[PDB]
Amino acid sequence: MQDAITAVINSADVQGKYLDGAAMDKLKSYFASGELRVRAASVISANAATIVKEAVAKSLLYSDVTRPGGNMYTTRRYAACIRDLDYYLRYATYAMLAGDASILDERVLNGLKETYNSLGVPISSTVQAIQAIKEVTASLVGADAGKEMGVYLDYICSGLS
Amino acid sequence: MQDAITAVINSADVQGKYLDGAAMDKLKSYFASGELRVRAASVISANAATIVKEAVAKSLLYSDVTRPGGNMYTTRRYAACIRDLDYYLRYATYAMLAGDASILDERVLNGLKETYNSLGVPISSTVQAIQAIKEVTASLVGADAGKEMGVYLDYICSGLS
Amino acid sequence: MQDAITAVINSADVQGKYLDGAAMDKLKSYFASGELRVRAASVISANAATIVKEAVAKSLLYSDVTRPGGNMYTTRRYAACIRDLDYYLRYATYAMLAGDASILDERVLNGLKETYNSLGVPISSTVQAIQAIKEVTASLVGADAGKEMGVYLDYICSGLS
Amino acid sequence: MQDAITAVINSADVQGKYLDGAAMDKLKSYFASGELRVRAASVISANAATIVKEAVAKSLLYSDVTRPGGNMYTTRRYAACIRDLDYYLRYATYAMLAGDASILDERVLNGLKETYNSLGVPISSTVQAIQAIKEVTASLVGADAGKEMGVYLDYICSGLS
Amino acid sequence: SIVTKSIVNADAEARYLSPGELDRIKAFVTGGAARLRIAETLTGSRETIVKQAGDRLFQKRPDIVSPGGNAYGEEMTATCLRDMDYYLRLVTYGVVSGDVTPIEEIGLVGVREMYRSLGTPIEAVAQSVREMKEVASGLMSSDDAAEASAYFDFVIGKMS
Amino acid sequence: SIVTKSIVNADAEARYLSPGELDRIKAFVTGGAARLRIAETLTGSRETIVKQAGDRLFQKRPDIVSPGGNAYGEEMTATCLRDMDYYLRLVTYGVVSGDVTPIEEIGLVGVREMYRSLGTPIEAVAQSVREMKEVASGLMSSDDAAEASAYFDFVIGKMS
Amino acid sequence: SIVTKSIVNADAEARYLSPGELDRIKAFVTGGAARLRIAETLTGSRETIVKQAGDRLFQKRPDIVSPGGNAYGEEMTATCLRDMDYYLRLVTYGVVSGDVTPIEEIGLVGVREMYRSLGTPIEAVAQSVREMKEVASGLMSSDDAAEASAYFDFVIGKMS
Amino acid sequence: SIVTKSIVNADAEARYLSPGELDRIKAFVTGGAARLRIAETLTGSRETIVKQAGDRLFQKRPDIVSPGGNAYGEEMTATCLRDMDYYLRLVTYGVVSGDVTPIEEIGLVGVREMYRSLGTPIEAVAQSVREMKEVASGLMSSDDAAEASAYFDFVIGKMS
Amino acid sequence: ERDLEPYIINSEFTALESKLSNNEINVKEFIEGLGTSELYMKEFYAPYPNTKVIEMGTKHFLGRAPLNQKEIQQYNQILASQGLKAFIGAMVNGMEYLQTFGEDTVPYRRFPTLPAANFPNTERLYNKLTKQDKELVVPSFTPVVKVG
Amino acid sequence: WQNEV
Amino acid sequence: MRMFRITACVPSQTRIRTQRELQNTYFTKLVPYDNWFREQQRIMKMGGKIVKVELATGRPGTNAGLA
Amino acid sequence: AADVVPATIARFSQLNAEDQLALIWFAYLEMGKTLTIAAPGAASMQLAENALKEIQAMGPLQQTQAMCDLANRADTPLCRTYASWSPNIK
Ligand SMILES: *[C@@H](C)[C@H]1/C(=C/c2[nH]c(/C=C3N=C(/C=C4\NC(=O)C(CC)=C4C)C(C)=C\3CCC(=O)O)c(CCC(=O)O)c2C)NC(=O)[C@@H]1C
Ligand SMILES: *[C@H](C)[C@H]1/C(=C/c2[nH]c(/C=C3N=C(/C=C4\NC(=O)C(CC)=C4C)C(C)=C\3CCC(=O)O)c(CCC(=O)O)c2C)NC(=O)[C@@H]1C
Ligand SMILES: *[C@H](C)[C@H]1/C(=C/c2[nH]c(/C=C3N=C(/C=C4\NC(=O)C(CC)=C4C)C(C)=C\3CCC(=O)O)c(CCC(=O)O)c2C)NC(=O)[C@@H]1C
Ligand SMILES: *[C@H](C)[C@H]1/C(=C/c2[nH]c(/C=C3N=C(/C=C4\NC(=O)C(CC)=C4C)C(C)=C\3CCC(=O)O)c(CCC(=O)O)c2C)NC(=O)[C@@H]1C
Ligand SMILES: *[C@H](C)[C@H]1/C(=C/c2[nH]c(/C=C3N=C(/C=C4\NC(=O)C(CC)=C4C)C(C)=C\3CCC(=O)O)c(CCC(=O)O)c2C)NC(=O)[C@@H]1C
Ligand SMILES: *[C@H](C)[C@H]1/C(=C/c2[nH]c(/C=C3N=C(/C=C4\NC(=O)C(CC)=C4C)C(C)=C\3CCC(=O)O)c(CCC(=O)O)c2C)NC(=O)[C@@H]1C
Ligand SMILES: *[C@H](C)[C@H]1/C(=C/c2[nH]c(/C=C3N=C(/C=C4\NC(=O)C(CC)=C4C)C(C)=C\3CCC(=O)O)c(CCC(=O)O)c2C)NC(=O)[C@@H]1C
Ligand SMILES: *[C@H](C)[C@H]1/C(=C/c2[nH]c(/C=C3N=C(/C=C4\NC(=O)C(CC)=C4C)C(C)=C\3CCC(=O)O)c(CCC(=O)O)c2C)NC(=O)[C@@H]1C
Ligand SMILES: CC1=C(/C=C/C(C)=C/C=C/C(C)=C/C=C/C=C(C)/C=C/C=C(C)/C=C/C2=C(C)C(=O)CCC2(C)C)C(C)(C)CCC1=O
């Protein structure tokens, strides 16, 4: 995967030139955002399970999906959905720390859209579940870190689209 | 895989309801037929190598398929064809005992048609071999159990076609 | 894999008949060519790395491929190109020694095109490198063996195309 | 391993004879045991976690064993002890339903004393744990079933010590 | 279904079904009438069975529906009643199938993770299925009582 | 033993016996009386059973005793009969035990190696076992005939 | 400890500790005075911190102490306070060490197994530790409150 | 980056970042200013560094610039100076990243095979990297030179 | 550890062999199928405790003895929760297996240098023929420091 | 109605 | 048993292996459902691109009878 | 009666924002002695102490303004944060 620094380094190295003023400005921006990102990561690590539980309850529980005949129906599929949302939360936190979406592209999005297509899993429902996760994490972390966390989650949903 | 009982259970669970009268009569029918199914499976297991032997002898042996240039020529591919026929017989017995073709479509036709097409295996000769298998099995078991075995083997033929 | 000898034997065996005058003619023609084949293979084995050296020097070095932004950039990708050219030279030597270009099909071209497309390798640059290798090998091993290697190298480049 | 039935079978077979009257009466005794063993196994499978839970609560729980210095300290060692009890209970149920301790002394006593010594395990505390297992199983299975279960658990304890 | 289980075992061993499997399927097909009788009785008396078992569970563990609990609120007690209905129907499915495959596949695999997510006391659920066991045994015949008790014992042990 | 068979199958998943396995153990322990009865009924006719089966097989496939054959000699005829006797003891063991495990552990595993080492025809020995089964079914009760023919059928199919 | 964690990572990569690891260890050892002081502070406020932590936990979820809960009587509530003192001691260990490895080694491995064998609501345990953290932060210096809150938060996440 | 390294380690463990890891990223982002200053110094004085290191290496190893050597000829010398510039750019990337992963990915994997193919003495290349190392150390402050020395001699050791 | 001629009525892995020859599964998948086999549990899982099963499984698949008490604990937990199939699947799909044998190499005996005692443990595992003895070469690693 | 303390 | 068939392209990012490598660099295998998640996690962590995946065996959304 | 809770819900429904807020305040006043006691730990308050601290920091006039905006479902960031929460959180 990549982070902000590795992304800038690769962007410079592709044309094979040294880090100029713009690259240094971007590095300064990431360095400033690092403290906020670390604090948000600490909060999400605090409330990993609760965020997923609240998001699913406000997004899927007592709805069509959880009923018999729904994808989330049955204990095995409920556990699968819970695990998928937990991994989504963890990897979105990873991307928030790294400052880059490359981790999501090459670790959360390749082989997942077509996997859901094979399994019949509701993409339109998992999108709303991710959005509920975004709302819960925004309420926990705050607007500042919440905006970038929602940016990464929207990236996940768009890739899943 | 699913037998008739498991298929009825799955159909009921799709709407998440207790088994109604339709499921009751389906299970009664399957339980009544199980007496015949067990005996047919027993006799097929008794003559398992047998039916394959006479079917191949009456269907493909001493023909162009076995002659040089034929798609069963050479001992390696001959043994491959024999192993394939044994596969078909065993999975037909499995489908007969289970009362459903779920196992068959799960295990025998998983890419078998495209595999045979790529290898250039003679589909018509394979169908004729399966027909000889069906005739021998019907002669050994009887008209009724022979009928179920034949419908399953015809499912194999349709998949291979 | 099949050589000229194996091709003749297969042509006889498909008809299931012993070798005849035409088979003897083919076998003796291959035996006559065997001296040149073995000498060319031995010389190419003796100086294989050098041949790749001049081929890459006169085909790709000091170009956009090796410059930043090109797929030959970075030491890892450069070594990948060197190893791939070694692959092509070794398998071309194998095909020349055998007399048949089936090793190239079942050991080189089998998925090579799709792998190159997935990884972003430039097929045109690869073809140019193949032509450079062919020219160097021809100049190094003479006229008849040069054409013999060149036909298989053109086979590989066409398969890439 | 082996049970009573396989014991009589192989005792006959080693001498290469059919079933004599002694074997017949042994088999009749095992069959008479029969439904009692199967019922005890079913009830144990019902309350599998129960017997271990109250056995710990009786013997090990609230003591220096579960206190600092004692081997039960830390949640990891506590869950390891619970896992050991679950192993012992499943092997006890298997040995009960079989009629012989071959399953245990092939799957329990082999190197168990030395491995527990390497881990510095309290053999006395373990023996007390199996004892409490014995009474909790007896209180749920009855008198004779509990007695035979206790006999198997006592063999386990003797092997452990 | 035990037929499917035997087929799975036979295909894993790459052999035709053994005399043990044949006798097992024969006994199941002959006892299918009694199994369907038990299933029909459970389906008919489902609501009384579930309600009595749920009330016995309430008496065992009042805190489950106490304020601040998972079942607190009429919504969160009706959801317990719904879960008990689901598990009773699953037991009916297992009884009619002869094996625990449908039970393990629909209510046992992932159940601990689901109840961890929802905060439910799976031990309390085990007590509830126990109480359903006594209630169904009371409402049901003695000879089939052991047969139903075997599957109740399996579910209680697994979900415990 | 079906007991040890289900025990091993359950231990593979590290769990107690399932309802299906316990039910089959119920059936086996109940029917052990009839199983032992068929045990005596087949153990009493050993001389006549093997004599008739081998005699019939000799004209079924005369090549076994034909010149240059596998059992052309008197000694090899007797040896083939003694193999028939061994396999009948093994089937008796299996029928009594309720499982084909004694058959597998005594006289089936590596038997192809045995009879390729000794050159004996596996199809011929399978036909011999079929003759044993036919004579046993003729000389025993109907239900006992099917019960013993199940294990004769298993050994015949597996070896063949 | 932080030194132990750095050593383990260096051993895993089969190399000497990097300059970043060395400077982190240097900073930790230099700043250890504050960590030892905060461990002393929590040790001193141990009795009260447990007292109002348990009080707030019981008020927020009396079902654990109410009839049917894990610690219903004063006896089992005393055991619950004993466990809370365990976890306070573990957080003190984590603060002094500088890294969460002592916490994981002592009271977070197999904790789900422990609190599923005991029937304890692990969510209730998490809430109790959370109230512990809240009261500790209240009675601790704010920045030092965050220093201890890191370990309290890690224990909370592992419990949940 | 250390951020990516910690993320990968946590993901391999299948967990979240520990408090010690998060503190390490905090320290890294704090030191990012000094890292950027060192990178700016190297970028500004790259051409002088490259020229001086090339002259020193040519004097130390005249064979490579001698006739028949790899670098013989003005164009070959210019290409080698281009390689020097490439490695200096990689060193700057490593300095800003705080780790050696970008340098290893871009110009340290397969470098041996690459220079063997090109007929370039890898020991001579390592000596040139060393010369750039001393030139940068002289041109740069003591602490910053110490920071860049890790990346410089990492490249030197890997390529040697 | 042996050719499976004298231990099988007939080859039950014929379907796996056909799939491998058709190239629809890789050698790693073939190895996993062999591990999740009735014969394997008969030979090395049925007649030995879980610790000996862990030793035999790691020796057969990863090519070396257990790494440490952490690995032993993980494998014992796997065996206790999901039995032997999950154990085989974990040991075959771990990153160590892919970094060593990849998706196409049949596993082979290894001669690791690290960690400590792994070389002697693998040596004792591999210098004895099959069924030579029932003792445990590496029952567990006596920790130097005992927690609590 | 009670729970054994 | 509801198996999955996947085509994945796994490049080499650390070592230049000098022998043939398409058979493990661009492959289509059949993966069991239970092991699919673990296999995909391993492939992504190894850096391969999952070109395609499809449930070759089994039926989608089977509420029962999936083995 | 079975429909006691839906009938009471509808009765609360027709009441206005002032009536609803006064009713909930008096319900809290009667809480414990007359109504159901409160066990807040069962709800994930961790995703709510942020808004709680924000409202505590807010001044009394803006405090009551935000409270009435929540009661009448006004379009405010605090209103949306409350709305997105689960009912137990609310
Ligand atoms: C001079 C003292 C040393 C030396 C240098 C030298 N290099 C070349 C040619 C090339 N060097 C590279 C290297 C790289 N390209 C990259 O992208 C990177 C990774 C980021 C590296 C390290 C390449 C690719 C070439 C080939 C030309 C090209 O531009 O692609 C030469 C010329 C060799 C020739 O025959 O042309 C020389 C002289 N050689 C020595 O002996 C010294 C140790
Ligand atoms: C009642 C005595 C216990 C209890 C139960 C309880 N359950 C829920 C919510 C759900 N229960 C399920 C369960 C299943 N769904 C399935 O598909 C299957 C098999 C067919 C099962 C077993 C699910 C999925 C839910 C979520 C809601 C939904 O289905 O849409 C609750 C509600 C929890 C809450 O606060 O929301 C409760 C109370 N809880 C206890 O404490 C008792 C021990
Ligand atoms: C929950 C929000 C939705 C949902 C979930 C669900 N998922 C599966 C099955 C799988 N999910 C995955 C996911 C991943 N693999 C990866 O590598 C990544 C990166 C983190 C992810 C997210 C995989 C691999 C599977 C297949 C294997 C497995 O089941 O574990 C299911 C089961 C589907 C079925 O059994 O047919 C379910 C139910 N379902 C919904 O309806 C939600 C929208
Ligand atoms: C209180 C916040 C919660 C609670 C607690 C509770 N615990 C027990 C019993 C035990 N708890 C432990 C735990 C540990 N011992 C250790 O050494 C470690 C690490 C240092 C841990 C985590 C143990 C071992 C016991 C058993 C008794 C003992 O310690 O000897 C109980 C009583 C259980 C019983 O049946 O007696 C209770 C009530 N319960 C809750 O509901 C709270 C959320
Ligand atoms: C608990 C009942 C008593 C106790 C024991 C204890 N055991 C361990 C660790 C292990 N126990 C075993 C034993 C077995 N594993 C098996 O597979 C079998 C047969 C099925 C047996 C008997 C093993 C192998 C281990 C180590 C591996 C693992 O963790 O699974 C511990 C922890 C030791 C440690 O150093 O951490 C303890 C404490 N101690 C008591 O006080 C109880 C009486
Ligand atoms: C008779 C139906 C068929 C037949 C038999 C035949 N067998 C042999 C020789 C041997 N057969 C065995 C087999 C076993 N011995 C055992 O103890 C058991 C395990 C319970 C078995 C299966 C063995 C070991 C031998 C040789 C040694 C010995 O006899 O003990 C022969 C003669 C071989 C020879 O060359 O001497 C024959 C003829 N042959 C047929 O054609 C029939 C189909
Ligand atoms: C026989 C009736 C016809 C025939 C057969 C034939 N098949 C192959 C090759 C393969 N057949 C299969 C099929 C399966 N493998 C399995 O494991 C199963 C599922 C249990 C099936 C259905 C496969 C996969 C192959 C290729 C790999 C292999 O060897 O198994 C051949 C040989 C092809 C070749 O060139 O090697 C042959 C000859 N041929 C006929 O002419 C008959 C009509
Ligand atoms: C070089 C002149 C061109 C070029 C090549 C290039 N290839 C790769 C990576 C791979 N190349 C192969 C090809 C083969 N492997 C074999 O075993 C054989 C048959 C025997 C062939 C043809 C493979 C499999 C890979 C990937 C796996 C591996 O390298 O082991 C790269 C690197 C791509 C990357 O970053 O991963 C490159 C650069 N690129 C060009 O631009 C030239 C035109
Ligand atoms: C200004 C102004 C006004 C004043 C307006 C104002 C200031 C009005 C104030 C309104 C407020 C703040 C009312 C508070 C209501 C809270 C209730 C009923 C608590 C419910 C919680 C419960 C039941 C707990 C449930 C719980 C249990 C047990 C669980 O099981 C799960 C957990 C949980 C904790 C959820 C007027 C409107 C009067 C007009 C004049 C005027 O000047």
Q: What distance in Å separates the CA atoms of residue C56 and residue C47, rounded to the nearest whole number?
A: 15
Cβ-Cβ contacts under 8 Å for A71 (sequence gap 6 or more) = A65, A77, A81, A120, A121, A122, A125, K61
Chains L and E physically touch (3 or more Cβ atom pairs below 8 Å)? yes
Beta-carbon count within 10 A of D53 CB: 20
Rg, C-alpha atoms of chain B: 18
Among E18, E98, E100, select the one facing F100 at the smallest CB separation: E18
For the beta carbon of residue I29, count every other beta carbon within 10 angstroms.
Answer: 22
Classify strands K4-9 and K49-54 as parallel, antiparallel or unpaired.
antiparallel
- Residue of G60, G111, G118 to test ligand 4 pocket, by largest number of atoms within 8 Å of CB: G118
H120-to-C58, F129, H69, H111 alpha-carbon distances in Å: 17, 78, 9, 10
Q: Do chains K and I touch (3 or more CB pairs under 8 A)?
A: yes
Helix (H, G, I), strand (E, B) or coil at A58: helix
Rounded to the nearest 10°, the torsion over CA B56, B59, B62, B65 is: -90
User: What are the phi and psi torsion angles at K26 (to 5°)?
Assistant: -135, 100
Radius of gyration for the alpha carbons in chain L, expressed in angstroms and rounded: 15
Q: What is the residue type of I141?
A: F
Burial of G153 (0-12, 13-18, 19+ CB in 10 A): buried
DSSP string spanning B80-149? Answer: HHHHHHHHHHHHHHHHHHHTSSHHHHHHTSSSHHHHHHHHT--HHHHHHHHHHHHHHHHHHH-HHHHHHH
In a mutagenesis test of the K interface, which of I18, I85, I104 is the best target, namely the one with the most K β-carbons within 10 Å?
I104
For residue B149 the two structure tokens come to 């075995």
Dihedral sign of CA atoms C58, C60, C63, C68 in order:
negative
Going by C-alpha positions, the residue among B37, B9, B36, B35 that lies closest to residue B97 is: B37
List the domain boundaries for chain A.
1-161
**Ligand located closest to B109 CA:** 7
**Alpha carbon nearest to ligand 8 atom 1, residue:** C81
Chain A: nearest CA to H7, how far in angstroms? 6
Ligand 7: residues with CB < 6 A are B 65, 71-72, 77, 80-81, 84-85, 87, 108, 112, 115, 119, 121-122, 125-126, 129; I 15, 18-19, 21-22
Shortest CA distance to E109 belongs to which of F67, K67, C10, A58?
K67
Where do we find the tokens 């068979």? Answer: F5
Nearest to A73 by CA among A84, A83, A86, A60: A60
Rounded Cα gap, residues D142 and D144, in angstroms: 6
- I138 by DSSP, 3-state: which? coil
Pairing label, strands K49-54, K26-31: unpaired
Residue B74 has φ and ψ, to the nearest 5°, of: 85, 140
- Rounded-to-integer distance, Cα G76 and Cα G74, Å: 6
CA distances from I10 to F154, I37, I40, I41 (A): 14, 14, 15, 17
The single residue listed with the structure tokens 């609560």 is D57
Q: Which two tokens stand for residue D117?
A: 């010594």
Amino acid type, C76:
R
Q: How many CA atoms lie within 13 A of E5 on its CB side?
A: 23
Residue I67 corresponds to which amino acid? L
Residue F158 has φ and ψ, to the nearest 5°, of -65, -50
Q: Which amino acid appears at position D84 of this protein?
A: D
Task: Give the rounded distance of the alpha carbon of B31 from its chain centre.
Answer: 21
User: How many angstroms separate the CA atoms of K61 and K66, rounded?
Assistant: 9
Token pair of D13, please?
A: 């077979």
Domain A1-161 part of CATH 2.60.130.10: no
- The DSSP string of B1-50 is ---HHHHHHHHHHHTT----HHHHHHHHHHHHHHHHHHHHHHHHHHTHHH
Give all chains having 3 or more CB-to-CB distances under 8 Å with chain G. Answer: A, D, E, H, I, J, L
Q: How far apart are CA D102 and CA D108, in angstroms?
A: 9
C107 contacts in chain K (CB < 8 Å)? 20
Asked if G127 and G134 count as a contact pair (C-beta separation under 8 A), the reply is no
Q: Encode chain E in three state secondary structure.
A: CHHHHHHHHHHHHCCCCCHHHHHHHHHHHHHHHHHHHHHHHHHHCHHHHHHHHHHHHHHHCHHHCCCCCCCCCHHHHHHHHHHHHHHHHHHHHHHHHCCCHHHHHHHHCCHHHHHHHHCCCHHHHHHHHHHHHHHHHHHCCCHHHHHHHHHHHHHHHHHC
Strand partners for K28: K7
Angstrom distance (rounded) from CA D21 to CA E1: 39
Element (H, E) at K50: strand K49-54
Say how far apart CA A156 and CA A134 lie, in whole Å.
Answer: 11
CA distance B144 to chain E (A): 18
Q: Are G71 and G83 in contact (CB under 8 A)?
A: no
Ligand 3 pocket test: pick from A73, A84, A125 the residue with the most ligand atoms within 8 Å of its Cβ. A84
| B146 to B52, B85, B149, D140: CA distances (angstroms) | 15, 17, 5, 51
Instruction: Identify whether the C-beta of residue C67 lies closer than 8 Å to the C-beta of residue C60.
Output: no
Do B16 and A73 form a contact (C-beta atoms < 8 A)?
A: yes
Record the resolution, in angstroms.
2.6
Q: Which residues of I123-141 are buried (b: 16+ CB within 10 A; e: fewer)?
A: eebbeeeeeeeeebbbbbb
Taking the centre of ligand 9 as the mean of its atom positions, its distance from the CA of residue D88, in whole angstroms, is 55
SS3 H58: helix
Alpha carbon of B108: minimum distance to chain A alpha carbons (Å):
20
CB I106 within 8 A of CB I34: no
Answer yes or no: is the C-beta of H50 below 6 A from any ligand 1 atom.
no
Q: Which residue of A has its CA nearest to L82?
A: A139
DSSP string, chain L: -TTHHHHHHHHHHHS-HHHHHHHHHHHHHHBTTTB----GGGS-GGGTHHHHHHHHHS-HHHHHHHHHHHHTT-S-HHHHHHHHS-TTT-
User: Which of ligand 1's atoms lies nearest the C-alpha of C78?
Assistant: 24
Residues written for chain G: 160
**Residues G100 and G154: beta-carbon distance below 8 Å:** yes
Residue K7 phi/psi, 5-degree rounding, is -110, 120
Closest C-alpha among H73, H89, H92, H108 to residue H144: H92
Let me know if chains H and G touch, i.e. at least 3 Cβ pairs under 8 angstroms: yes
Is the C-alpha dihedral spanning H110, H115, H117, H118 positive or negative? positive
3 state DSSP class of F14: coil
Residue F83 half-sphere exposure toward CB, CA atoms < 13 A: 23
G153–A48 C-beta distance less than 8 A: no
Q: Kindly list the partner chains of chain I, i.e. chains with 3 or more CB atom pairs below 8 Å.
A: B, D, E, F, G, K
Q: Taking CB atoms and an 8 Å cutoff, what residues of chain K touch B106? A: 1-2, 57-58
Query: Per this entry, what is the length of chain E?
Result: 160
Provide the number of CB pairs (under 8 Å) joining chain A to chain E: 39
- Chains in contact with A, where contact requires at least 3 CB pairs less than 8 Å apart: B, C, E, G, H, K, L
Residue K22 to residue C80, Cβ atoms within 8 A = no
Cα-flanking dihedrals φ and ψ of residue F100, to 5°? -80, 5
- Those residues with Cβ within 8 angstroms of residue A30's Cβ, 6 or more apart along the chain or in another chain: A3, A4, A5, A99, H29, H32
Q: Which amino acid is at A46?
A: A
- Dig out the tokens for I8 from the structure: 């099988």
**Interface test mutation site (partner E, options F109, F144, F153, F154, max chain E beta carbons within 10 A):** F154
Q: Whose CA is nearest to atom 23 of ligand 9?
A: L38
Cα–Cα dist J2/K46, whole Å: 58
Distance (Å) from the alpha carbon of H21 to chain A's nearest alpha carbon: 10
Rounded Cα–Cα distance for residues G140 and G137 (Å): 5
> Long-range contacts: D145-149, Cβ < 8 Å, 24+?
D145/D36, D145/D37, D145/D39, D145/D40, D145/D96, D146/D40, D148/D37, D148/D40, D148/D96, D149/D40, D149/D44, D149/D92, D149/D96
Collapsed DSSP state (helix, strand, coil) of residue H141: coil
Nearest one of F143, K33, B51, F24 to E3, comparing CA atoms: F24
Asked if residue A157 belongs to a known ligand binding site, the reply is no
CA distance F88 to F133: 9
Whether residue B18 contacts residue E43, with contact meaning beta carbons closer than 8 Å, is answered with: yes
Tell me the angle at which helices B75-98 and B48-59 cross, rounded to the nearest 10 degrees: 130
Looking at residue B22, its amino acid is A
Q: How far is the CA of L29 from the centre of ligand 9 (A)?
A: 9
A36's CB contacts (< 8 A; 6+ apart) are A144, A145
User: What tokens were used for B27?
Assistant: 């299970």
Tokens 């839970």, located at residue: D53
What is the C-alpha separation between C119 and C114, in angstroms, rounded? Answer: 9
- The single-letter DSSP state of residue F18 is P
Q: Computed from CA positions of residues I106, I111, I116, I120, in that sequence, does the dihedral angle turn out positive or negative?
A: positive
The single residue listed with the structure tokens 């779920």 is: B102
Which residues does E58 contact at the CB level (< 8 Å), separation at least 6? E64, E65
CA L22 to ligand 9 centroid distance, Å:
8
DSSP D60: I
Cα first-last separation, chain F? 23
Whether the bond into I115 is cis, omega within 30 of 0 = yes
CB E95 within 8 A of CB E147: yes
Please check whether residue E105 is in contact with residue A77, taking contact to mean a CB–CB distance below 8 angstroms. no
Q: Rg of the Cα trace of chain G? A: 17
Q: Which long-range contacts (CB under 8 A, 24 or more apart) does F51-57 make?
A: F51/F81, F52/F131, F52/F135, F53/F84, F53/F128, F53/F129, F53/F131, F53/F132, F53/F134, F53/F135, F54/F80, F54/F81, F54/F84, F54/F128, F54/F131, F56/F131, F56/F134, F56/F135, F57/F124, F57/F127, F57/F128, F57/F131
Report the largest interatomic distance among the alpha carbons of chain C, rounded to a whole angstrom.
Answer: 61
Instruction: Report the run of H or E that residue I78 belongs to, with start and end.
Output: helix I69-93
